[PDB]
Amino acid sequence: SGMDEIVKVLSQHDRILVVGHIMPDGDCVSSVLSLTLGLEKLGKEVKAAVDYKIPYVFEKFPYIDKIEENPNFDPELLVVVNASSPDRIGKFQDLLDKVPSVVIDHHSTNTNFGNWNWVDPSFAATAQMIFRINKALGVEYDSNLATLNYLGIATNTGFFRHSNADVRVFEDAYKLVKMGADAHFVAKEILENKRFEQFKLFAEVLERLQLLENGKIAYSYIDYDTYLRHNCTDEDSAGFVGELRSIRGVEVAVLFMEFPRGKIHVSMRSKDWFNVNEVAFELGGGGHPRAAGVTFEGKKIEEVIPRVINHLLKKFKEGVE
Amino acid sequence: SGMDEIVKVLSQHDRILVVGHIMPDGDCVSSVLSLTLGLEKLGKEVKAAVDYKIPYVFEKFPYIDKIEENPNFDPELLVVVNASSPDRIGKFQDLLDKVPSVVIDHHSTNTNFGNWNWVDPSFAATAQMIFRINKALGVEYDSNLATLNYLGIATNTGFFRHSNADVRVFEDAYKLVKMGADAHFVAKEILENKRFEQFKLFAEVLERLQLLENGKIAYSYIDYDTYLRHNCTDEDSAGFVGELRSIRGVEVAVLFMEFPRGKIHVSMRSKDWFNVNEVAFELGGGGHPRAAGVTFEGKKIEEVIPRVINHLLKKFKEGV
Numbered sequence: 067s068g069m070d071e072i073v074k075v076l077s078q079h080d081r082i083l084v085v086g087h088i089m090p091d092g093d094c095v096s097s098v099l100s101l102t103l104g105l106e107k108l109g110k111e112v113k114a115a116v117d118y119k120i121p122y123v124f125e126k127f128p129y130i131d132k133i134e135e136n137p138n139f140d141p142e143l144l145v146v147v148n149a150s151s152p153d154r155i156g157k158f159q160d161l162l163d164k165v166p167s168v169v170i171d172h173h174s175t176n177t178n179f180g181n182w183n184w185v186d187p188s189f190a191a192t193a194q195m196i197f198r199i200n201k202a203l204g205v206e207y208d209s210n211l212a213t214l215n216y217l218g219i220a221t222n223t224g225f226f227r228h229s230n231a232d233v234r235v236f237e238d239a240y241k242l243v244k245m246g247a248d249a250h251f252v253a254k255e256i257l258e259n260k261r262f263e264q265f266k267l268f269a270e271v272l273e274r275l276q277l278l279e280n281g282k283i284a285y286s287y288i289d290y291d292t293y294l295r296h297n298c299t300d301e302d303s304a305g306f307v308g309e310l311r312s313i314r315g316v317e318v319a320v321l322f323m324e325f326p327r328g329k330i331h332v333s334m335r336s337k338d339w340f341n342v343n344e345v346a347f348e349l350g351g352g353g354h355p356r357a358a359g360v361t362f363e364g365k366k367i368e369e370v371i372p373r374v375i376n377h378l379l380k381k382f383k384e385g386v387e
Numbered sequence: 388s389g390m391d392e393i394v395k396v397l398s399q400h401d402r403i404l405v406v407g408h409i410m411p412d413g414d415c416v417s418s419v420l421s422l423t424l425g426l427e428k429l430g431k432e433v434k435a436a437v438d439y440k441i442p443y444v445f446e447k448f449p450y451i452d453k454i455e456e457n458p459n460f461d462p463e464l465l466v467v468v469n470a471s472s473p474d475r476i477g478k479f480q481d482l483l484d485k486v487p488s489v490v491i492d493h494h495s496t497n498t499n500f501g502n503w504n505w506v507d508p509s510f511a512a513t514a515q516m517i518f519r520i521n522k523a524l525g526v527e528y529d530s531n532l533a534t535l536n537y538l539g540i541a542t543n544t545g546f547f548r549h550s551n552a553d554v555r556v557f558e559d560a561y562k563l564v565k566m567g568a569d570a571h572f573v574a575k576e577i578l579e580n581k582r583f584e585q586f587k588l589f590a591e592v593l594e595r596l597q598l599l600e601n602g603k604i605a606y607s608y609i610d611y612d613t614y615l616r617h618n619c620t621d622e623d624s625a626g627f628v629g630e631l632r633s634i635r636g637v638e639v640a641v642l643f644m645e646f647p648r649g650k651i652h653v654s655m656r657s658k659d660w661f662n663v664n665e666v667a668f669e670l671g672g673g674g675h676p677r678a679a680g681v682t683f684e685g686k687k688i689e690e691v692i693p694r695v696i697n698h699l700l701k702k703f704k705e706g707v
């Protein structure tokens with residue numbers, strides 16, 4: 067339930083598979099690698115896995131190749147990090163009935179699907195919880211480990227810009243930079259790594275932009291054929307919904323992205339007050355008050371857009387009193 | 388001079404004018420207001436001024452209206468912050484050698500033009516130096532003052548992206564947020580305030596973009612008529628050079644901007660190693676190892692661009 071029990075369980079087991087969520091992000095990579103490396107420093111036999119391609123922006127990060135897609139491994143313990151439901155780890159959810167499991171997560175909707183669960187939504191990033199676990203285990207940080215742990219705190223707060231960048235976030239960042247975290251490397255690789263093809267793709271997104279409610283709601287979409295024409299994938303569009311939110315006067319931005327064929331990811335971002343996690347959760351996804359999402363399979367963009375936007379529109383209009 | 392002498396000088400004067408630089412940025416607003424408000428807590432009569440319009444993105448900040456353009460004031464002491472030479476403060480340079488003056492700055496090419504000068508280029512922002520002065524003066528931060536002092540640290544590190552975001556930057560940011568700095572407010576006002584017209588403007592920047600040296604140099608330009616065509620000003624283009632640096636593989640980005648007619652501002656940004664301040668300084672400007680600029684008056688943009696690019700390319704090879 068709490069950190070102390072999870073530390074004990076981690077200490078009790080030797081052969082550990084650490085698993086993160088599909089469509090991984092910086093906090094997934096950060097949490098998986100920081101815990102994996104910490105456990106290896108203790109002398110444990112560990113592998114790391116995500117049922118998804120790792121985005122190109124992580125290619126230069128130290129030890130990124132320890133995250134596998136198809137590990138061959140006989141674990142005594144499964145550790146699932148940064149993932150709110152079993153569906154979020156893809157094919158590794160088949161291990162949940164076979165191998166004892168620990169969940170470590172900061173999402174408030176986490177279904178507590180492990181044998182042991184430490185879920186604390188007062189953190190901005192699961193990487194903050196791994197930092198505390200590692201310190202409680204006595205793991206000594208070098209600059210690479212500090213850089214890897216800094217990654218998730220930076221990305222989940224928008225590099226200290228979002229509503230979740232509180233005192234504890236800045237304190238953790240300071241501690242990690244003091245330990246040698248390369249904050250410039252992290253920002254360069256995540257934020258200054260744009261393929262030029264992105265700009266043309268984003269122009270098409272602006273072309274298709276739709277405005278509702280005096281311009282306070284904005285949404286657009288990228289169908290699969292459009293990714294193809296621009297020689298782009300979902301890795302290329304990762305910053306787009308935040309760019310739509312940055313438009314003056316917009317309170318909610320929504321981007322629908324079909325990649326690969328038939329899989330529609332819906333990203334939602336809000337600015338001052340609208341709780342987008344409430345919309346996402348009711349649609350079957352999850353997230354946070356200012357950033358949330360949901361994913362559909364086998365469905366048509368002509369049906370997802372009205373279903374999502376009509377539900378969002380209703381909840382937005384109700385949010386006035 | 389060191390900080391301790393400057394703190395002594397500040398304590399010795401009760402009527403003080405705090406001045407920042409023309410074309411003000413976040414560190415200028417941050418430094419000017421944080422020092423002014425700090426000194427006022429000692430009971431002193433303090434005015435703040437910049438010989439320039441304050442950009443729109445600062446208009447919701449607490450006490451922003453304290454920065455005047457035309458103060459009517461007889462100070463005993465002039466304090467110049469975040470400005471590397473007398474020219475950078477516009478008409479207030481006329482006060483030098485008439486009112487005793489203090490310079491507080493983090494630019495390495497500061498000409499030391501005050502009677503007292505504390506210049507420390509190891510800081511990422513002059514706001515960090517103002518923070519330490521206010522602490523030495525013994526004043527108390529509330530959340531408004533913490534937010535105003537946080538502003539310059541945030542903007543001058545590119546919100547913790549630039550290579551100047553060292554451990555001391557994160558320590559200061561932590562201490563200010565602990566005192567109530569509203570980091571989310573600062574980011575939203577500066578970065579989430581984009582006009583639709585800005586996106587059309589940037590599209591023109593991308594149409595004129597050139598990549599040189601196998602994609603390691605990116606440059607473009609905005610002429611005056613293009614600003615007008617898009618109903619934009621140079622306030623709309625303020626983040627553009629950073630967007631060009633964010634292209635994969637680009638080491639240095641350069642943006643030439645003519646606004647208003649006959650004034651050409653050249654903005655430069657680099658990623659890993661190229662010292663753009665050496666280029667800017669040699670052309671008559673200044674700045675920092677990874678961010679620098681120069682401004683020309685009365686010159687033709689079609690003449691400035693090939694000469695600046697030629698000098699840049701020459702320095703780029705020598706740096707290699």
Ligand SMILES: Nc1nc2c(ncn2[C@@H]2O[C@H](COP(=O)(O)O)[C@@H](O)[C@H]2O)c(=O)[nH]1
Nearest residue numbers: 150333334351352353354357358359360361
């Ligand atoms: N449960 C769940 N949460 C999601 C899904 N997609 C996005 N999220 C949540 O929404 C946040 C933002 O996702 P993004 O819009 O960046 O894809 C994530 O941090 C995650 O918490 C999804 O398919 N399922």
Ligand SMILES: Nc1nc2c(ncn2[C@@H]2O[C@H](COP(=O)(O)O)[C@@H](O)[C@H]2O)c(=O)[nH]1
Nearest residue numbers: 471654655672673674675678679680681682
């Ligand atoms: N001396 C001098 N420095 C400048 C000038 N323009 C820009 N800089 C320097 O270059 C940096 C970046 O300028 P920006 O590109 O953001 O306009 C500034 O922080 C400042 O130190 C100028 O006209 N003169």
Ligand SMILES: [Mn+2]
Nearest residue numbers: 091093094148
């Ligand atoms: Mn995640």
Ligand SMILES: [Mn+2]
Nearest residue numbers: 173352353354
């Ligand atoms: Mn999340």
Ligand SMILES: [Mn+2]
Nearest residue numbers: 412414415469
């Ligand atoms: Mn400045």
Ligand SMILES: [Mn+2]
Nearest residue numbers: 494673674675
């Ligand atoms: Mn400067």
